[PDB]
Each structure stands twice: as structure tokens, then as C-alpha cells.
């Protein structure tokens, strides 16, 4: 539906939507920008990520509320409405995954871009895994795992330990271990190792880069504090 709008206007409108806290509009503007076929810049990748994280984050928060009510209840209304929210959540994850496969990831050659898009791929499969049941489920979990693993492998080869995308990738992969893969020891190991290697590289950073890195290091510390 955004086919007739200039790319630069879609980007501009995404930034306006962010200021207005209109995250569904923001995501639609950014989907239209991706669909122009050109690679995204660093700033544009961030707008894409912020938009969908806010949209799916509202759906997930609602799903958790409804699932909690459903589990305490265990007529069809609670289950039906939880299913409705779940289906819409699945649709947004499928949209993001579709953008990544057609054709963001295949054109992303630089480490910063490729790691960012593989992290996103792991995050949206993880969101699908949060609601999945059975073994359909196992392949979804392994898809999240595989995307995170490839991103980790590139990030370790190509980025400093303080790089914010590397740090956020590790943070999210460690959550994946803790709550999706039933591997809390792996989650704790990964968060600790990541925190420690970033600490030892802070000395190389400017004041601004230090601020960016320590912000995500604090989220790693928050998780280790909760989990140990």
C-alpha cells in the first residue's frame, strides 16, 4: 500500500510516526521503505527495528495477559480472544521474517548490517516460539537458534566486544536460552562472558560510545541479577 510514496518520504513519515508514538504507522512506513528494494542505512535499520519491536511488544504483552487468564480458567471466549491476538502476533512476525528473507539478509554484506538482520530473524522466530506448541515448535525454536548462532559467529569475527548490536544480540540470545531453550546455565554463561569481554574493551571507546555500550551492559547485569 506504500508503493506510490517516495522512499525518502516514507523514511521521513516513519520518524514523524515515532515522535507521535504511532508505531503501527511507523512499521507500515518502514515496510514500504524496505519494499523499495534498496539496502537500508544504519539509521533506517534502527527505525525498522524500533517500529516492529513496539508493535509486536504490545501484542506480546496482551497475549501474556490473556494466556494468564486462560490458564487460571483451566466458555470459549478467553481462548478465542487469546487465539485472535496470537494470530495477529504471528502475522506481524511473518511479515518481518518475510522482509528479512525478501531480500534484506541476502543483500547484507557488511558485518553491521548482516548481524543486525540475523539478530532480528532470531528475535521474531523467538516471538513465534513464545506462542508455539509441540514439535512444529521444535523447528521454530531451532530457526531462532540458527539465526542467532550465525549472527554470533559473524559478530565475534567482525565486531568489537563493545559493539551495541553485538551486545544486544548476546543479551537476546541469552534470553532465548533461558526461557525458550530451557538452558538457564547457557543463558547465564553467555551473559557473563559477554559482560566481561565488553568491560575489558571499554577503554578503547569515546565518551559517546562508552555511554552506548554500558547501557546494554547494564541490561546484561540486570538479567544476571535476576537469574542468580
Amino acid at each position: 500500500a506504500m508503493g506510490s510514496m517516495e522512499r525518502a518520504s516514507l523514511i521521513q513519515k516513519a520518524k514523524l510516526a515515532e515522535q507521535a508514538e504511532r508505531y503501527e504507522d511507523m512499521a507500515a512506513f518502514m515496510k514500504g521503505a524496505v519494499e523499495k528494494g534498496e539496502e537500508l542505512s544504519c539509521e533506517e535499520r534502527n527505525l525498522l527495528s524500533v517500529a516492529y519491536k513496539n508493535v509486536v511488544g504490545g501484542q506480546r504483552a496482551a497475549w501474556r495477559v490473556l494466556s494468564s487468564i486462560e490458564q487460571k480458567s483451566n466458555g470459549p471466549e478467553v481462548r478465542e480472544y487469546r487465539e485472535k491476538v496470537e494470530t495477529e502476533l504471528q502475522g506481524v512476525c511473518d511479515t518481518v521474517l518475510g522482509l528479512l528473507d525478501s531480500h534484506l539478509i541476502k543483500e547484507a554484506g557488511d558485518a553491521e548490517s548482516r548481524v543486525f538482520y540475523l539478530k532480528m530473524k532470531g528475535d521474531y522466530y523467538r516471538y513465534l516460539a513464545e506462542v508455539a506448541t509441540g514439535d512444529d515448535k521444535k523447528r521454530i525454536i531451532d530457526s531462532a537458534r540458527s539465526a542467532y548462532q550465525e549472527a554470533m559467529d559473524i559478530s565475534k569475527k567482525e565486531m568489537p566486544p563493545t559493539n551495541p548490536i553485538r551486545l544486544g544480540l548476546a543479551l537476546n540470545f541469552s534470553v532465548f536460552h533461558y526461557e525458550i531453550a530451557n538452558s538457564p546455565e547457557e543463558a547465564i554463561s553467555l551473559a557473563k562472558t559477554t559482560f566481561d569481554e565488553a568491560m575489558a574493551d571499554l577503554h578503547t571507546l569515546s565518551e559517546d560510545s562508552y555511554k552506548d555500550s554500558t547501557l546494554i551492559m547494564q541490561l546484561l547485569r540486570d538479567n544476571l541479577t535476576l537469574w542468580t
Binding site: 528475535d123 543479551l171 534470553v175 526461557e179 540486570d222
Partner: peptide, 6 residues
């Protein structure tokens, strides 16, 4: 607290 992701 709920665990952090980013």
C-alpha cells in the same frame, strides 16, 4: 522484574 531484551 521482567528479564531485559533489546
Amino acid at each position: 522484574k521482567r528479564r531485559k531484551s533489546v
